[PDB]
Design a protein around this ligand. Structure first.
Ligand SMILES: [Ca+2]
Ligand SMILES: [Ca+2]
Ligand SMILES: [Ca+2]
Lengths: 207, 207
DNA sequence: CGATAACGGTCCTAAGGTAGCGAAGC
DNA sequence: GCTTCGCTACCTTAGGACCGTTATCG
């Protein structure tokens, strides 16, 4: 339990990079979990319908389904639409991040670069996001969730189904169905480093 | 649904004040709920075992149990130690704020001064905090909570029992039991607005 | 006569939300 | 050759977490 302004020791940082490197190689998720609990000294959590409702309200507060569009020269067009699920939390709160990992049975917990002791859980694979993350929200979040977040969910889902149909491979599906969703979902349009400044700017670069 | 950078419009702000001004005059809480439901177009709710567990996760995320220590010239010792529970959310998520109100049966929703469109729900009445808020944390939160947050609950509760026994108007207990719990729960020590630099300074002032 | 309820104001990083690049793979 | 994985750095604001007075009330 580390206090405000107090940093994650560089060694624990080392070990985290290491145990993430390990699961990458062996794909032993079961061992990923074990590694984490020992590193962060985390008590077991059984995964019950109750702990899952707890998680669900935690994600309502703390999680984000977002979509980036960035330039990739080698890509079929100039650009790439890249969804992610992520949840942030200070180390003191890893127990709840660790709960998420067990429920989704996928994800990686990293240190948040630039932060003193902040951790982040991300799930970027599209199969994991359709099979694990989206059905979680529909099952345990949506009933209690706000209109803005419910829409967030249907839209992330729409995108992923598009991707299932190679609409990012096509061009009259991309510009007119994928990029829209990206634009409608931004919460930081106007950012300094922003991929693109508006819908059309990205549409007029798919071209 | 307000976009990033959209202020909550002034007609709503004014209407929220009349609504808070009305419940303070009448004490008709069911009616406060009705007014908020209609002001924000919120779907009226069953409080279930299920929606409580969801609120538990949300509060782990967005709620704060805090203790402030501040000069008050007219008080027995010139300073007051003051517990507060609050929960903050952008207006697009008022629906879960309404759920909290509905589960605690008390609290007030107000606009966060100086924000685009954020709202804060507060409970400061010490009987409410004892009879409603902590029991909720005990029944639904603490099982899934992080070690730090569990300990903040126990320490909040320890303060509330001290105040009930009047430790705050006995110099010794104020100095020796009350102030040290305040000090251990601090999260903003060294902020420019802080009422006391540190624990010693607060014990010295009281003496 | 006080305590404390009541409620606004203030601070400011831990949370949200993004983009980029090398390496690895249908 | 083009898409996806992993990890790192990045940017930006709604959250947390206080503090300051004045109304209320036994
Ligand atoms: Ca990615
Ligand atoms: Ca939060
Ligand atoms: Ca008070």
């Amino acid at each position: 339990i580390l206090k405000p302004g107090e940093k994650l020791p560089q060694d624990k940082l080392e070990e985290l990079k290491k145990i993430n490197d390990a699961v990458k190689k062996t794909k032993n998720f079961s061992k990923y979990l074990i590694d984490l609990r020992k590193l962060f000294q985390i008590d077991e959590v059984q995964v019950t319908s109750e702990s899952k409702l707890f998680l669900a309200g935690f994600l309502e507060g703390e999680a984000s389904l977002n979509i980036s569009t960035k330039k990739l020269a080698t890509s079929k067009f100039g650009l790439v639409v890249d969804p992610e699920f992520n949840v942030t939390r200070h180390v003191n709160g890893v127990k709840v991040l660790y709960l998420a990992l067990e429920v989704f049975k996928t994800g990686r917990i990293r240190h948040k670069s630039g932060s003193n002791a902040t951790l982040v859980l991300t799930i970027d694979n599209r199969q994991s996001l359709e099979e694990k993350v989206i059905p979680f929200y529909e099952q345990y979040v949506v009933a209690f969730s706000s209109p803005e977040k419910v829409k967030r969910v249907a839209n992330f889902k729409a995108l992923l189904e598009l991707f299932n149909n190679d609409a990012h491979q096509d061009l009259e599906q991309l510009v007119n169905k994928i990029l829209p969703i990206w634009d409608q979902m931004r919460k930081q349009q106007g950012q300094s480093n922003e991929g693109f400044p508006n819908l059309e700017a990205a549409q007029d670069f798919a071209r």
